[PDB]
Amino acid sequence: MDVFVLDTSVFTNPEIYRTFEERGAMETFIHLALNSRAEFYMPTSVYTEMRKIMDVGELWAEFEMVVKIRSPRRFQLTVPADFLYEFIEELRYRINKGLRIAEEHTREASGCEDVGKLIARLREKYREALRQGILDSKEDVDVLLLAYELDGVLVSADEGLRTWADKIGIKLIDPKNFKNILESLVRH
Template sequence: WLVKKTPDRYEVKIPARIFHEYVAFMRARINKGMGVAEDAIWSAATECLFLTSSARTKKDIEDNIEREVIGKTIGKFRNKYRSALRYGILDSAPDIDVLLLAKEIDAAVVANDFGIQKWAEELGVRFVPAKTFPLMLKEYLKQRSSISHSTKSDFFDDFEES
Protein backbone atom coordinates (compact mmCIF):
# COMPACT_ATOMS: atom_id res chain seq x y z
CA TRP A 1 0.00 0.00 0.00
CA LEU A 2 0.99 3.55 -0.60
CA VAL A 3 0.42 5.92 2.26
CA LYS A 4 0.50 9.66 1.80
CA LYS A 5 2.18 11.26 4.80
CA THR A 6 3.88 14.55 5.55
CA PRO A 7 6.96 14.64 7.74
CA ASP A 8 6.63 15.54 11.41
CA ARG A 9 8.57 18.78 11.19
CA TYR A 10 8.73 19.18 14.96
CA GLU A 11 9.99 15.72 15.87
CA VAL A 12 12.39 14.80 13.07
CA LYS A 13 15.90 15.78 14.13
CA ILE A 14 18.66 16.60 11.69
CA PRO A 15 22.26 17.48 12.51
CA ALA A 16 22.84 21.23 12.77
CA ARG A 17 25.79 20.79 10.40
CA ILE A 18 23.41 19.97 7.53
CA PHE A 19 21.37 23.10 8.21
CA HIS A 20 24.60 25.10 8.47
CA GLU A 21 25.85 23.82 5.11
CA TYR A 22 22.49 24.49 3.48
CA VAL A 23 22.57 28.15 4.51
CA ALA A 24 26.16 28.55 3.26
CA PHE A 25 25.16 26.89 -0.03
CA MET A 26 22.12 29.15 -0.46
CA ARG A 27 24.18 32.27 0.25
CA ALA A 28 26.66 31.22 -2.44
CA ARG A 29 23.81 30.64 -4.90
CA ILE A 30 22.25 34.03 -4.11
CA ASN A 31 25.61 35.73 -4.67
CA LYS A 32 26.15 33.78 -7.90
CA GLY A 33 22.73 34.91 -9.14
CA MET A 34 23.64 38.49 -8.31
CA GLY A 35 26.86 38.11 -10.32
CA VAL A 36 24.95 36.82 -13.35
CA ALA A 37 22.54 39.76 -13.15
CA GLU A 38 25.42 42.23 -12.76
CA ASP A 39 27.09 40.83 -15.89
CA ALA A 40 23.84 41.30 -17.82
CA ILE A 41 23.55 44.91 -16.62
CA TRP A 42 27.17 45.65 -17.62
CA SER A 43 26.64 44.08 -21.03
CA ALA A 44 23.36 45.88 -21.76
CA ALA A 45 24.64 49.24 -20.52
CA THR A 46 27.88 48.94 -22.50
CA GLU A 47 25.89 48.05 -25.61
CA CYS A 48 23.65 51.12 -25.11
CA LEU A 49 26.66 53.38 -24.59
CA PHE A 50 28.27 51.97 -27.71
CA LEU A 51 25.15 52.49 -29.83
CA THR A 52 24.73 56.10 -28.69
CA SER A 53 28.38 57.18 -28.74
CA SER A 54 30.85 57.94 -31.47
CA ALA A 55 33.11 55.08 -30.37
CA ARG A 56 34.18 52.68 -33.12
CA THR A 57 34.43 49.68 -30.79
CA LYS A 58 33.15 48.83 -27.33
CA LYS A 59 36.74 49.07 -26.11
CA ASP A 60 36.77 52.75 -27.15
CA ILE A 61 34.06 53.66 -24.64
CA GLU A 62 35.69 55.71 -21.94
CA ASP A 63 36.39 53.70 -18.80
CA ASN A 64 35.39 56.53 -16.49
CA ILE A 65 31.96 56.89 -18.14
CA GLU A 66 31.44 53.16 -17.86
CA ARG A 67 32.57 53.20 -14.24
CA GLU A 68 30.61 56.31 -13.25
CA VAL A 69 27.33 55.48 -14.97
CA ILE A 70 27.20 51.71 -14.95
CA GLY A 71 29.08 51.34 -11.66
CA LYS A 72 26.53 53.45 -9.77
CA THR A 73 23.68 51.46 -11.28
CA ILE A 74 25.35 48.20 -10.28
CA GLY A 75 25.81 49.50 -6.73
CA LYS A 76 22.11 50.37 -6.44
CA PHE A 77 21.20 47.01 -7.93
CA ARG A 78 23.34 45.12 -5.38
CA ASN A 79 21.67 46.88 -2.46
CA LYS A 80 18.17 46.23 -3.78
CA TYR A 81 18.99 42.64 -4.70
CA ARG A 82 20.41 41.84 -1.27
CA SER A 83 17.48 43.50 0.42
CA ALA A 84 14.94 41.60 -1.68
CA LEU A 85 16.56 38.19 -1.42
CA ARG A 86 18.17 38.20 2.01
CA TYR A 87 15.78 40.20 4.20
CA GLY A 88 14.17 37.98 6.81
CA ILE A 89 16.21 34.86 6.10
CA LEU A 90 19.26 33.32 7.70
CA ASP A 91 21.86 34.27 5.14
CA SER A 92 25.14 33.30 6.74
CA ALA A 93 26.77 30.50 8.68
CA PRO A 94 27.46 32.82 11.66
CA ASP A 95 23.71 33.56 11.89
CA ILE A 96 23.08 29.84 12.26
CA ASP A 97 25.88 29.48 14.81
CA VAL A 98 24.45 32.28 16.97
CA LEU A 99 21.02 30.66 17.04
CA LEU A 100 22.32 27.14 17.63
CA LEU A 101 24.56 28.28 20.48
CA ALA A 102 21.77 30.31 22.08
CA LYS A 103 19.48 27.28 21.87
CA GLU A 104 22.18 25.01 23.27
CA ILE A 105 23.01 27.17 26.31
CA ASP A 106 19.51 28.63 26.78
CA ALA A 107 20.68 32.19 26.14
CA ALA A 108 19.10 35.22 24.53
CA VAL A 109 20.26 36.57 21.18
CA VAL A 110 20.99 40.27 20.71
CA ALA A 111 20.93 41.27 17.05
CA ASN A 112 19.79 43.83 14.53
CA ASP A 113 18.85 41.25 11.91
CA PHE A 114 15.26 40.40 11.04
CA GLY A 115 16.23 36.92 9.85
CA ILE A 116 17.82 36.11 13.20
CA GLN A 117 14.81 37.56 15.04
CA LYS A 118 12.35 35.55 12.95
CA TRP A 119 14.23 32.28 13.42
CA ALA A 120 14.97 32.91 17.10
CA GLU A 121 11.23 33.14 17.67
CA GLU A 122 10.69 30.02 15.55
CA LEU A 123 13.25 28.09 17.62
CA GLY A 124 11.96 29.40 20.95
CA VAL A 125 15.11 31.43 21.63
CA ARG A 126 14.77 34.74 23.47
CA PHE A 127 15.52 37.72 21.24
CA VAL A 128 16.56 41.26 22.20
CA PRO A 129 16.71 43.97 19.50
CA ALA A 130 20.22 45.44 19.36
CA LYS A 131 18.94 49.02 19.60
CA THR A 132 17.25 48.34 22.97
CA PHE A 133 20.08 46.29 24.47
CA PRO A 134 22.31 49.17 25.69
CA LEU A 135 19.37 50.72 27.56
CA MET A 136 18.45 47.35 29.06
CA LEU A 137 22.04 46.81 30.15
CA LYS A 138 22.27 50.27 31.73
CA GLU A 139 19.02 49.68 33.60
CA TYR A 140 20.20 46.27 34.76
CA LEU A 141 23.51 47.67 36.04
CA LYS A 142 21.70 50.56 37.73
CA GLN A 143 19.32 48.15 39.49
CA ARG A 144 22.15 45.82 40.43
CA SER A 145 24.16 48.71 41.81
CA SER A 146 21.26 50.00 43.93
CA ILE A 147 20.55 46.50 45.26
CA SER A 148 24.23 45.98 46.02
CA HIS A 149 24.50 49.30 47.90
CA SER A 150 21.31 48.77 49.88
CA THR A 151 22.41 45.27 50.86
CA LYS A 152 25.80 46.51 52.08
CA SER A 153 24.17 49.41 53.88
CA ASP A 154 21.63 47.15 55.57
CA PHE A 155 24.40 44.77 56.58
CA PHE A 156 26.45 47.51 58.25
CA ASP A 157 23.34 49.03 59.88
CA ASP A 158 22.52 45.64 61.38
CA PHE A 159 26.11 45.21 62.53
CA GLU A 160 26.21 48.61 64.30
CA GLU A 161 22.95 47.93 66.14
CA SER A 162 24.34 44.78 67.75
Protein backbone atom coordinates (compact mmCIF):
# COMPACT_ATOMS: atom_id res chain seq x y z
CA MET A 1 0.00 0.00 0.00
CA ASP A 2 0.97 3.68 0.09
CA VAL A 3 4.12 4.68 1.99
CA PHE A 4 4.14 7.88 4.06
CA VAL A 5 7.22 10.05 4.59
CA LEU A 6 6.86 11.54 8.05
CA ASP A 7 8.32 14.80 9.32
CA THR A 8 8.94 16.67 12.56
CA SER A 9 5.95 18.92 11.88
CA VAL A 10 3.33 16.18 12.31
CA PHE A 11 3.50 15.47 16.04
CA THR A 12 5.12 18.48 17.67
CA ASN A 13 3.08 21.32 16.16
CA PRO A 14 0.37 22.24 18.72
CA GLU A 15 -2.58 22.03 16.31
CA ILE A 16 -1.61 18.58 15.04
CA TYR A 17 -0.73 17.72 18.63
CA ARG A 18 -4.37 18.41 19.47
CA THR A 19 -6.06 16.69 16.52
CA PHE A 20 -4.10 13.53 17.43
CA GLU A 21 -6.20 12.30 20.37
CA GLU A 22 -4.96 15.23 22.49
CA ARG A 23 2.43 11.92 25.22
CA GLY A 24 -0.98 10.44 24.45
CA ALA A 25 -0.79 11.72 20.87
CA MET A 26 2.36 9.68 20.25
CA GLU A 27 0.95 6.39 21.55
CA THR A 28 -2.41 6.80 19.81
CA PHE A 29 -0.54 7.61 16.59
CA ILE A 30 1.64 4.53 17.12
CA HIS A 31 -1.28 2.16 17.60
CA LEU A 32 -3.08 3.61 14.60
CA ALA A 33 0.12 3.37 12.54
CA LEU A 34 0.87 -0.27 13.36
CA ASN A 35 -2.37 -1.26 11.62
CA SER A 36 -2.97 -1.90 7.89
CA ARG A 37 0.75 -2.00 6.97
CA ALA A 38 1.02 1.57 5.74
CA GLU A 39 4.82 1.76 5.79
CA PHE A 40 6.12 5.05 7.18
CA TYR A 41 9.53 6.67 6.96
CA MET A 42 11.46 9.48 8.60
CA PRO A 43 15.03 10.70 8.04
CA THR A 44 17.61 10.47 10.81
CA SER A 45 18.35 14.20 10.84
CA VAL A 46 14.70 15.04 11.47
CA TYR A 47 14.69 12.33 14.15
CA THR A 48 17.62 13.81 16.05
CA GLU A 49 16.30 17.38 15.84
CA MET A 50 12.89 16.24 17.08
CA ARG A 51 14.26 14.13 19.93
CA LYS A 52 16.55 17.00 20.92
CA ILE A 53 13.59 19.39 20.93
CA MET A 54 10.97 17.01 22.36
CA ASP A 55 11.36 13.90 24.52
CA VAL A 56 8.92 11.20 25.66
CA GLY A 57 9.83 8.54 28.21
CA GLU A 58 10.25 4.93 27.08
CA LEU A 59 7.53 5.26 24.42
CA TRP A 60 10.20 5.50 21.71
CA ALA A 61 10.42 1.70 21.41
CA GLU A 62 7.34 1.22 19.26
CA PHE A 63 8.21 4.41 17.39
CA GLU A 64 11.45 2.76 16.34
CA MET A 65 9.30 -0.28 15.54
CA VAL A 66 6.95 1.32 13.02
CA VAL A 67 8.50 4.55 11.72
CA LYS A 68 11.63 3.58 9.82
CA ILE A 69 14.61 5.92 10.15
CA ARG A 70 16.73 6.09 7.00
CA SER A 71 18.94 8.53 5.16
CA PRO A 72 18.01 9.45 1.58
CA ARG A 73 20.99 7.71 -0.08
CA ARG A 74 21.99 11.07 -1.52
CA PHE A 75 24.52 9.46 -3.88
CA GLN A 76 22.01 7.96 -6.33
CA LEU A 77 19.58 10.91 -6.47
CA THR A 78 19.46 13.88 -8.82
CA VAL A 79 17.38 17.05 -8.51
CA PRO A 80 16.45 18.98 -11.68
CA ALA A 81 18.42 22.14 -12.33
CA ASP A 82 15.40 24.45 -12.63
CA PHE A 83 14.56 23.61 -9.01
CA LEU A 84 17.91 24.98 -7.83
CA TYR A 85 17.60 27.96 -10.18
CA GLU A 86 14.22 28.96 -8.74
CA PHE A 87 15.36 28.34 -5.15
CA ILE A 88 18.34 30.68 -5.43
CA GLU A 89 16.44 33.28 -7.47
CA GLU A 90 13.83 33.56 -4.70
CA LEU A 91 16.45 33.46 -1.94
CA ARG A 92 18.13 36.58 -3.32
CA TYR A 93 14.90 38.58 -2.92
CA ARG A 94 14.47 37.23 0.60
CA ILE A 95 17.98 38.35 1.58
CA ASN A 96 17.40 41.87 0.27
CA LYS A 97 14.11 42.13 2.17
CA GLY A 98 15.83 41.03 5.37
CA LEU A 99 18.54 43.65 4.92
CA ARG A 100 15.93 46.38 4.44
CA ILE A 101 14.08 45.31 7.60
CA ALA A 102 17.35 45.33 9.54
CA GLU A 103 18.05 48.87 8.30
CA GLU A 104 14.65 50.24 9.30
CA HIS A 105 14.89 48.64 12.74
CA THR A 106 18.35 50.18 13.23
CA ARG A 107 16.87 53.62 12.56
CA GLU A 108 13.95 52.94 14.90
CA ALA A 109 16.43 51.88 17.60
CA SER A 110 18.30 55.14 17.07
CA GLY A 111 14.99 56.96 17.46
CA CYS A 112 13.85 55.74 20.89
CA GLU A 113 15.18 53.83 23.91
CA ASP A 114 12.95 50.74 23.83
CA VAL A 115 15.67 48.27 22.92
CA GLY A 116 14.12 45.06 24.26
CA LYS A 117 10.77 45.38 22.49
CA LEU A 118 12.49 46.35 19.24
CA ILE A 119 14.84 43.36 19.48
CA ALA A 120 11.81 41.11 19.94
CA ARG A 121 10.16 42.74 16.91
CA LEU A 122 13.35 42.20 14.89
CA ARG A 123 13.29 38.51 15.83
CA GLU A 124 9.71 38.35 14.56
CA LYS A 125 10.29 40.25 11.31
CA TYR A 126 13.66 38.82 10.20
CA ARG A 127 12.51 35.20 10.61
CA GLU A 128 9.39 35.98 8.59
CA ALA A 129 11.54 37.71 5.97
CA LEU A 130 13.97 34.83 5.39
CA ARG A 131 13.07 31.53 7.03
CA GLN A 132 9.36 31.67 6.21
CA GLY A 133 8.32 30.38 2.80
CA ILE A 134 11.21 28.28 1.45
CA LEU A 135 13.47 25.39 2.48
CA ASP A 136 15.34 26.85 5.44
CA SER A 137 17.30 24.06 7.16
CA LYS A 138 18.74 20.75 6.01
CA GLU A 139 16.04 18.61 7.63
CA ASP A 140 13.54 19.84 5.04
CA VAL A 141 15.85 18.98 2.14
CA ASP A 142 16.38 15.57 3.68
CA VAL A 143 12.61 15.06 3.87
CA LEU A 144 12.27 16.04 0.21
CA LEU A 145 15.01 13.69 -0.99
CA LEU A 146 13.81 10.74 1.10
CA ALA A 147 10.24 11.25 -0.12
CA TYR A 148 11.43 11.72 -3.70
CA GLU A 149 13.14 8.35 -4.16
CA LEU A 150 10.51 6.16 -2.45
CA ASP A 151 7.59 7.87 -4.24
CA GLY A 152 6.15 8.48 -0.79
CA VAL A 153 3.35 10.74 0.41
CA LEU A 154 4.98 13.74 2.09
CA VAL A 155 3.26 14.80 5.31
CA SER A 156 4.11 18.21 6.72
CA ALA A 157 2.59 21.35 8.22
CA ASP A 158 5.39 23.50 6.78
CA GLU A 159 4.08 25.90 4.16
CA GLY A 160 7.56 26.41 2.71
CA LEU A 161 8.03 22.68 2.21
CA ARG A 162 4.74 22.05 0.41
CA THR A 163 5.33 24.38 -2.54
CA TRP A 164 8.85 23.11 -3.16
CA ALA A 165 7.65 19.51 -2.91
CA ASP A 166 4.97 20.38 -5.45
CA LYS A 167 7.56 21.78 -7.86
CA ILE A 168 9.64 18.60 -7.80
CA GLY A 169 6.81 16.13 -8.40
CA ILE A 170 6.16 14.60 -4.98
CA LYS A 171 2.57 13.69 -4.20
CA LEU A 172 1.35 15.56 -1.14
CA ILE A 173 -1.40 14.93 1.40
CA ASP A 174 -3.53 17.18 3.58
CA PRO A 175 -1.68 17.53 6.91
CA LYS A 176 -4.83 18.53 8.79
CA ASN A 177 -6.67 15.34 7.74
CA PHE A 178 -3.79 12.90 8.31
CA LYS A 179 -5.31 11.40 11.46
CA ASN A 180 -8.70 10.74 9.84
CA ILE A 181 -6.96 9.47 6.69
CA LEU A 182 -4.92 6.99 8.69
CA GLU A 183 -8.00 5.88 10.64
CA SER A 184 -10.12 5.30 7.54
CA LEU A 185 -7.28 3.41 5.88
CA VAL A 186 -6.93 1.27 9.02
CA ARG A 187 -10.61 0.43 9.45
CA HIS A 188 -11.95 -0.16 5.94
